Symmetry: C3
Subunit: 217 residues, 3 copies
C-alpha cells in the first residue's frame, strides 16, 4: 500500500474522501499512520494532531508518552511528537488552531508554516508568520523553543513550567498558550494551568474544544 | 454500472457477523469502495445510514457542491453526499427508514417500501415508494418526485427559494412537509418550519434532537 | 494473514498503536474480530468488552442478543458472550473495571483473572480474586453464576432477578453490581436497577461511565 499511497489528509480529500474521520496515511519513510482528517474546516484537508473535547483523557504526561502519543480515536489525543515531526519535516505545512468555549463561540488562529524537530533537538518548535485569526496570536511567543514535560525540563525558566502549569508545551517563561493543560471547564480561579490561549479567552478560561491541525501550504 | 467482489450493503455485513453499529466499507456498483455508517440494531439491523443529526455540531445549510460530495464527520453529523446516495439506491430496491428522537427522548419513525434518488443529471430527483408505517406519520410522500434543491440551486415550485426560506436542503416542492436538513433549533422554535421538522410528527415548530435516514435492501 | 496479525490489543500496543480505538485481531481459531483497545489506562493494551457512557443503547436485552453482541462502536456496546468467551478461552487474562460518576471521580477494580464459560455451560462467571480497587469488590459475590437475561432464568431466586432489575448479569438472589442495568443517569428513586456497584455508589445511584476489559499476563 505505501506505493502511491496518500501522504496527508489533503491527498485524501483530493482523492475524494469528504467526511471527517480517521484514515491511514503514509509517512515519508513509508510507515503507515492512522490520523484524524478534518475535511470541513477552512476548505478541508487538515491533519489533526491534537484534540481536546471533554476532559476524559489525562494530558499531564511524561516525555515518553508525548513522544509516542496518547489518547483515543473516539475523543481526545496527542498524535505523538515523533509523528508530528514526521508530518512536518519535509515540505511546508501550515498550522490551524480551532478553539471552542462553553458558550459555543468559535475562534481560530492560522500560521503560515509549522514544523517540529526530531527528538534529538527537543522537538523544537519552528513556527512561521501569523496569518489571521480571531483567537489572536498566542504561539509566536513560543517560537524556536524546545518542548517540555513534567519529567523533562527544557524551558527558559528557573522552575519547571510543565509542572507549574500542569501541561506540556514549547514553554519559555512560561507561556502564552497551553492547549495541553488541564481540562478546567470555563473560567477557573487557578492561574494559567487550564487549556488556555492568552489572546483568546485569557489565562483564566479553559476552552471546551481545542484542535491543532496541519495542511501543506 | 453490482459488485460480486465483496459486501454491497450493511445487510451483507450484518450477515457476516458484524453485530455492532459503526463505520464499515461497502462496495458500490463499479466496485467503488465507500465507508458508511451501519445501524446494526434498529428494526433487525443492517441499515446504511446516509443522514445523521445529533448535536447541532455541523452546519447543514450548505450549497449544491457540498451536498453532492457529502459533508460532516464520522464522529458525528454527516450527509453521505447525493452522488453516494444515488449510487447506493440506483441498483435494486431499498427500504427507507427515518428514526427521530425529541428532547424528552421520545422515539418516532417512518418507513417506506422503496427509496432511490436519480443522478446529478436529474437533480437527484426523489423517487419514493409507499408508506409502510410509523409513529411519526408520513411527511415524505408529499415530496415524491421532486428535484433536490439547495440555497444556490432553486429547483422548487415556489417563486421564492425554499432552501433559503427554510434554511435547508431537500426535495422542496412548495415548500415542504419535512425539512430534516434544516437548522438544529433544539426543540421548540417560533420561526416557521426552518428546523429539523417533520410535520406529521412534532409539527412545523419543533426541531428534533436526533435524526437518522437509512436504507436496507427490501 | 492470520499467523502474521495480532491476537490481542496487547500485541497491537507492542507494534506501536498508541491510540485507543477499534482494530481487528485474530482469535485462537483464526476468526477475525474487531475490538476496542484501551491503549491508555494502566500501561494500556486492554481489549474492552463492555462500555457504558451516555445511556443511548438499550441494555435491557435477551439471551440471543447478549449472545452475539449488541451496541455501537461509536459508543456503548456489549462485545457478546461467545466473543467474550473466545477471548478469555485459552490462556489467562486480568479483568479491570473502570467507573466514573457524574462528578468525574475515577474508580477501578482489577482481578487476577477473568473468563466466561462457553455457550454450552451457560455463561458462567469464572473470576480470579480482587487486587487493588478504589471502587471495592462488588463482583467476587457473583463469581460462579450463569449469565441470565429477561428471557432466561439461571439465577438463585423465585423471580427473574434480571426482569426485576432490568439488567443482564451473573445474578443470584440477587446482585451487588448491575453494570448492564439502566443508565438511570445518577441519583435515582428505584432500587438496584441502575448501572450499580455497591462498594462504589450503593444501590440508588447510576454511573456516568463503566468499562470492563481484559489483558493477558
Ligand atoms: C476534526 C473533527 O472531527 N471536527 C472538528 C470538530 O470536532 C470541532 O468541534 C470543530 C472545531 O473546528 O470542527 C472540527 O475542528
Ligand atoms: C450508531 C447509530 O446508528 N446510532 C443510533 C442508531 O442505532 C439509532 O438510529 C438511534 C435510535 O434509533 O440511536 C442512535 O444513536
Ligand atoms: C413516478 C411519477 O409520478 N413521475 C411522473 C411522470 O411519470 C409523469 O409523466 C409526470 C407528468 O407530470 O411527471 C412525474
Ligand atoms: C477508555 C477507553 O477504552 N475508551 C476510550 C478512552 O481512552 C477515552 O478516554 C474515551 C473518550 O470518550 O473513550 C474512548 O475513546
Ligand atoms: Ca527550568
Ligand atoms: Ca423557485
Ligand atoms: Ca429467579
Amino acid at each position: 500500500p505505501c506505493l502511491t499511497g496518500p501522504r496527508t489528509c489533503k491527498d485524501l480529500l483530493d482523492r475524494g474522501h469528504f467526511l471527517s474521520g480517521w484514515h491511514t496515511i503514509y509517512l515519508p519513510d513509508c510507515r503507515p499512520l492512522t490520523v484524524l482528517c478534518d475535511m470541513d474546516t477552512d476548505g478541508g484537508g487538515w491533519t489533526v494532531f491534537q484534540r481536546r473535547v471533554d476532559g476524559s483523557v489525562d494530558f499531564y504526561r511524561d516525555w515518553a508518552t508525548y513522544k509516542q502519543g496518547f489518547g483515543s480515536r473516539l475523543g481526545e489525543f496527542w498524535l505523538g511528537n515523533d509523528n508530528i515531526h514526521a508530518l512536518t519535516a519535509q515540505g511546508t505545512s501550515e498550522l490551524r488552531t480551532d478553539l471552542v468555549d462553553f458558550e459555543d463561540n468559535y475562534q481560530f488562529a492560522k500560521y503560515r508554516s509549522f514544523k517540529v524537530a526530531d527528538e534529538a533537538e527537543k522537538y523544537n518548535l519552528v513556527l512561521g508568520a501569523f496569518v489571521e485569526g480571531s483567537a489572536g496570536d498566542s504561539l509566536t511567543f513560543h517560537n524556536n523553543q524546545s518542548f517540555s514535560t513534567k519529567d523533562q525540563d527544557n524551558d527558559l525558566n528557573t522552575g519547571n513550567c510543565a509542572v507549574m502549569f500542569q501541561g506540556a508545551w514549547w514553554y519559555k517563561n512560561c507561556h502564552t498558550s497551553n492547549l495541553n493543560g488541564r481540562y478546567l471547564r470555563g473560567t477557573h480561579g487557578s492561574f494559567a494551568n487550564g487549556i488556555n490561549w492568552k489572546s483568546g479567552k485569557g489565562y483564566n478560561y479553559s476552552y471546551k474544544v481545542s484542535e491543532m491541525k496541519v495542511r501543506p501550504a
